[PDB]
Write a protein that binds this ligand. Structure first.
Ligand SMILES: *[C@@H]1O[C@H](CO)[C@@H](O[C@@H]2O[C@H](CO)[C@@H](O)[C@H](O)[C@H]2NC(C)=O)[C@H](O)[C@H]1NC(C)=O
Ligand SMILES: *[C@@H]1O[C@H](CO)[C@@H](O)[C@H](O)[C@H]1NC(C)=O
Ligand SMILES: *[C@@H]1O[C@H](CO)[C@@H](O)[C@H](O)[C@H]1NC(C)=O
Ligand SMILES: *[C@@H]1O[C@H](CO)[C@@H](O)[C@H](O)[C@H]1NC(C)=O
Lengths: 374, 91, 101, 286, 49, 101, 49
């Protein structure tokens, strides 16, 4: 029972009824120890995404099947040279083949076989969304340098013209530069005024330049203050933040989920980091989710597709994926098959056939999409 | 703002006992939303949007006309005030 | 004038009080009458629901509550209201051309 | 990875030298008259109840500076000038506003598409959109008969190889090329005129190809899968695929440098030259 | 079939089915530019300011 | 003085940014909004019983998850529904245009 | 004077000496700056919708 793939639910108490879309889904094992606990057949019925593709396959290869949920473990991290979990339930030939959600990887791929994968996936990161990533250099933004220097030289030359015209028409450099600058800048400043019509005209038309300049500049700044970019903070597990955890900050909180596949990867490439993580396990998904809503948890690492789902379906239309889907430990889901059934080939060609006719468009667009997709 | 309003249709020569069948049929079709897909497959196009905005410019237009009017209002009020000085030329 | 029920709730005095009705369709009706030379007497429906085709009696029969019921059983002989078009309804009734898409 | 499209992007009309942009030069002259209009009205109202100065006064009021020392002596011109200044503020504000409006709001661009864009369901002249013959793309099309009108309409232009197609779309010979991502995206990031478009189709993947069942086939598979955890694969990318970037985004607001302000910088120098000989003739009046 | 608007003159020489899709008489006109109010300047304030 | 100009400008700019850019509002929907394909607690969305709306739903089985999820709230008449949505008792009502508009 | 101050004081004017009035007129101008800036922002608003 992973979230948006294999939804479970109980029949309308009327007559074992459910909603023709689903299929019967008893978990005919009831966990109990006080009584003999004959495996109780509690009929339920499941539906979702994975299920549909199961159904279409079965129809196109002409067989039949029942479902059978699982009890001990979830995805079977092997222990003591032993596989619990559904990998268990298929390696001990009690159950023929497994669907649902099983990441592919080496350790698994030699005890059973595998089909061709459905959909991209892998390890990725989720982190709450900050605010206002406006550049600390916003003010210097809307101009190059050439504006400023062209301004400067215009200053000098017009000042010289003041010298050359003011002496002969009818107290210059000690002030003239000061005046003109001030004029450019919304002339708070006070200053004595050059008498004589020549300079009068000159400085006036200069100020005309001033008004245009200032107004333009403000417009441009108003431009930039509308196209932000929300540059995210963490930028991939290679970041040292995810490497100097307690060192270079009030430490993070690298929530995870034990027992999984991902964990099995981390503890094979950054054992150091695995150590620091150990004390933040979040059973299930929603636990970590809420704990991420309320500061208990800083950032989260987990399978991808489940995240690219849980994102686009949260009311606050912002959670986020760190790099706009920078899936990096990359592989696919699949379908388990116990070793060497001459079927495997058939399943294979079948699913590929499916990819042909674009139905893995419709299924995708019917379940694995959400609002806030932008 | 469609105003002289009606529908298209399908012609049938008078009184074929069919007519009823065609009728119930097309309605049946409206049932199953297929006149969604057909519609969305042919009678749609790009530029389908409600409103937008284009960078108008270069305004020698009625707006600034109104502004200049508020201006000339000044000359009006000024001349109105002017004569008042004549009043106290007598007091 | 418009004879109707005080059916503010189940169990009411059910007193079929007269009231007066008016608006859009009534206007339409009047035009039709003055161009079609007859008379008429409106009155609201019993229940208030438009009408659908439901089995009842816990036997093999399916009738309509709602307006269409009083259309077929004779209580009435023309429905003028915001009545939708459909399929099933078009099985047992005839429909004038539409008048507001 | 999967399939996408590509098509030549059009360069925005971010006009700099357009300095007089928001004002329809007519209106500018209108200002140039109204100013003297009110000026003469002023000194008229002065003489009855400072006849060259008021000119200075007004032009100052508009240009925020350059002040003489005039004033109203009357009572009328008091109100006159007051509202005059009001007018001035209104102008300069409005001007700023519309400059902003122009600068931030861009063209409504429609090169964007999808796959269900009717403009790719009912071709015309103006949309030839080929592909590479004998290529997996082809096989995907023909066996989806519901797309047939596309299929056949494309067959009359299909190209021979990547370089052919890309070098083609450089020069608008076609309009749209349709191929797979991990070539187009690298392209659009290295070369700097081309750009991808909406979402994907064919979640496929590449892969090592074997014969029928030469044994160690199975072997090789294992190795690949391993490499996807030591990052070694993941490493190779930076070494080859995502290293060169033309900064590329939506239509971003762009700082301006010198293609605009020169547009009036020159005016500056002009005010210079005139002055000098005005000086001479000023002495003449003297 | 094809496209035949319904109306009186037609509707008595033949019959008709139930219609598909809304329609009727309407108008097309090229699109102007810049319909900015001639009162833009007075816009952003009430009087009380 | 340079500093001064920088301030006052920037201030104007950000005031503009605030004043023109509004919230990203998501009440907008369609019919295929998944938020109406996989209901939860927070989306009760009823209709009028025995009404043409109903007939359209049930006979389109592919919508069934909607259908049944709605049956547990369906109202009695217009005024009921409207007066309901006045006070957030529900979230969404679904009916025909020439009344809602 | 005060009016001019509100309106981007092109105008020239004699200045009131004495610290009381000095403070008063200063803080008034503070009002002025806010006012003008706001107003421009709002106009920039309308010139987009
Ligand atoms: C995997 O999930 C199991 C839940 O089955 C968790 O493990 C421990 O869970 C078992 C199951 O009841 C308990 O008997 C142990 O006492 C638990 N703690 C241990 C073994 O230290 C846990 O979420 C995952 N397993 C481990 C070993 O962490
Ligand atoms: C594995 O389990 C066996 C008993 O089944 C035990 O004797 C052995 O010590 C265990 N070793 C490890 C490494 O789990
Ligand atoms: C962003 O804003 C929210 C509320 O607006 C608040 O949590 C805080 O100010 C900021 N939080 C983060 C994580 O950026
Ligand atoms: C609108 O602009 C176009 C070109 O930009 C030109 O025909 C003319 O200036 C205006 N035409 C109409 C009909 O508004």
């Amino acid at each position: 029972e992973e979230a948006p793939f294999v939804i479970v639910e109980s029949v309308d108490p009327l007559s074992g009824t459910c909603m023709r879309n689903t299929v019967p889904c008893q978990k005919r094992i009831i966990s109990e120890n006080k009584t003999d606990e004959e495996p109780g057949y509690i009929k339920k019925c499941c539906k979702g995404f994975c299920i549909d593709i199961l159904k279409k396959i079965s129809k196109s290869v002409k067989f039949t099947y029942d479902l059978y949920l699982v009890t001990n473990g979830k995805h079977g991290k092997k222990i003591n040279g032993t596989w619990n979990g559904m990998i268990g339930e298929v390696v001990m030939k009690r159950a023929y083949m497994a669907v649902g959600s099983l990441t592919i990887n080496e350790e698994r791929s030699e005890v059973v076989d595998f089909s061709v994968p459905f959909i991209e996936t892998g390890i990725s990161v989720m982190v709450s969304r900050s605010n206002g990533t406006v550049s600390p250099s916003a003010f210097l933004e809307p101009f190059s340098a050439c504006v400023w220097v062209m301004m400067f030289v215009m200053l000098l030359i017009v000042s010289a013209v003041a010298v050359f015209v003011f002496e002969y028409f009818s107290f210059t450099i000690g002030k003239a530069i000061w005046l003109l600058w001030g004029l450019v800048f919304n002339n708070s400043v006070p200053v004595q005024n050059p008498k004589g019509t020549t300079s009068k005209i000159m400085v006036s038309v200069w100020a005309f330049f001033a008004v245009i300049f200032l107004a333009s500049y403000t417009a441009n700044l108003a431009a930039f203050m509308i196209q932000e970019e929300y540059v995210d903070q963490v930028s991939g597990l290679s970041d040292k933040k995810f490497q100097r955890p307690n060192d270079f900050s009030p430490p993070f909180r690298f929530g995870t989920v034990p027992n999984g596949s991902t964990e099995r990867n981390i503890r094979n490439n950054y054992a150091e980091m695995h150590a620091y993580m150990g004390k933040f396990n979040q059973r299930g998904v929603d636990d970590a989710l809420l704990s991420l809503k309320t500061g208990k948890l800083d950032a989260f690492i987990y399978d991808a597709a489940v995240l690219n789902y849980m994102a686009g379906r949260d009311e606050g239309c912002k959670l986020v994926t760190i790099g706009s889907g920078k899936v990096f430990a990359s592989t696919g889901y699949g379908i388990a098959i116990q070793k060497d059934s001459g079927w495997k080939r058939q399943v294979d060609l079948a699913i590929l056939q499916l990819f042909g006719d674009g139905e893995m468009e419709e299924l995708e667009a019917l379940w694995l999409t959400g609002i806030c997709h932008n | 703002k469609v105003f002289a309003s009606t529908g298209y249709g399908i012609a049938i020569q008078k009184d074929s006992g069919w007519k009823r069948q065609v009728d119930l049929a097309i309605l049946q079709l409206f049932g199953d939303g297929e006149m969604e897909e057909l519609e969305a497959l042919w009678l749609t196009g790009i530029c389908h949007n409600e409103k937008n905005e284009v960078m108008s410019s270069q305004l020698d237009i009625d707006n600034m006309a109104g502004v200049f009017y508020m201006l000339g209002a000044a000359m009006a009020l000024s001349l109105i005030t002017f004569i008042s000085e004549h009043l106290f030329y007598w007091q | 004038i418009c004879t109707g029920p005080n059916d503010t709730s189940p169990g009411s005095p059910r007193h079929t009080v007269p009231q007066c009705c008016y608006g859009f369709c009534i206007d339409l009706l009047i035009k039709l009458a003055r161009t079609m030379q007859f008379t008429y007497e409106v009155h609201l429906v019993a229940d208030g629901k438009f009408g659908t085709q439901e089995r009842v009696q816990n036997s093999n029969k399916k009738e309509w509550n709602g307006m269409m019921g009083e259309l077929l059983s004779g209580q009435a002989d023309m429905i003028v209201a915001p009545l939708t078009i459909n399929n099933e309804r078009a099985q047992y009734i005839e429909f004038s051309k539409p008048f507001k898409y | 990875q999967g399939l996408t499209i590509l098509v030549k992007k059009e360069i925005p009309r971010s006009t700099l030298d357009s300095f007089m942009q928001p004002f329809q030069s007519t209106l500018w002259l209108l200002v140039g008259l109204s100013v003297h209009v009110v000026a003469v009205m002023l000194y008229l109202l002065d003489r009855f109840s400072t006849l060259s100065s008021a000119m200075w006064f007004s032009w100052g009021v508009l240009l925020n500076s350059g002040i003489g020392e005039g004033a109203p002596r009357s009572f009328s011109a008091r109100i006159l000038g007051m509202v005059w200044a009001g007018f001035a503020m209104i102008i300069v504000a409005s001007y700023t506003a519309n400059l902003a409006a122009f600068l931030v709001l861009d063209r409504p661009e429609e090169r964007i598409t999808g796959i269900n864009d009717p403009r790719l369901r009912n071709p015309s002249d103006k949309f030839i959109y080929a592909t590479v013959k004998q290529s997996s793309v082809d096989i995907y099309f023909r066996r989806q008969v519901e797309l047939s009108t596309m299929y056949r309409h494309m067959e009359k232009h299909n190209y021979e190889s990547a370089a052919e197609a890309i070098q083609a779309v450089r020069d608008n010979k076609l309009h749209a090329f349709i191929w797979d991502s991990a070539v187009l995206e690298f392209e659009a990031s290295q070369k700097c005129d081309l750009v991808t478009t909406g979402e994907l189709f064919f979640r496929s993947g590449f892969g090592i190809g074997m014969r029928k069942d030469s044994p160690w086939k199975q072997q090789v598979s294992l190795s690949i899968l391993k490499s996807h955890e030591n990052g070694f694969m993941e490493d190779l990318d930076k070494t080859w695929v995502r290293y060169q970037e033309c900064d590329s985004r939506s239509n971003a607001p762009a700082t301006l440098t010198c293609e605009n302000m020169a547009g009036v910088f020159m005016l500056v120098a002009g005010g210079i030259v005139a002055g000098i000989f005005l000086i001479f003739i000023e002495i003449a009046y003297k």
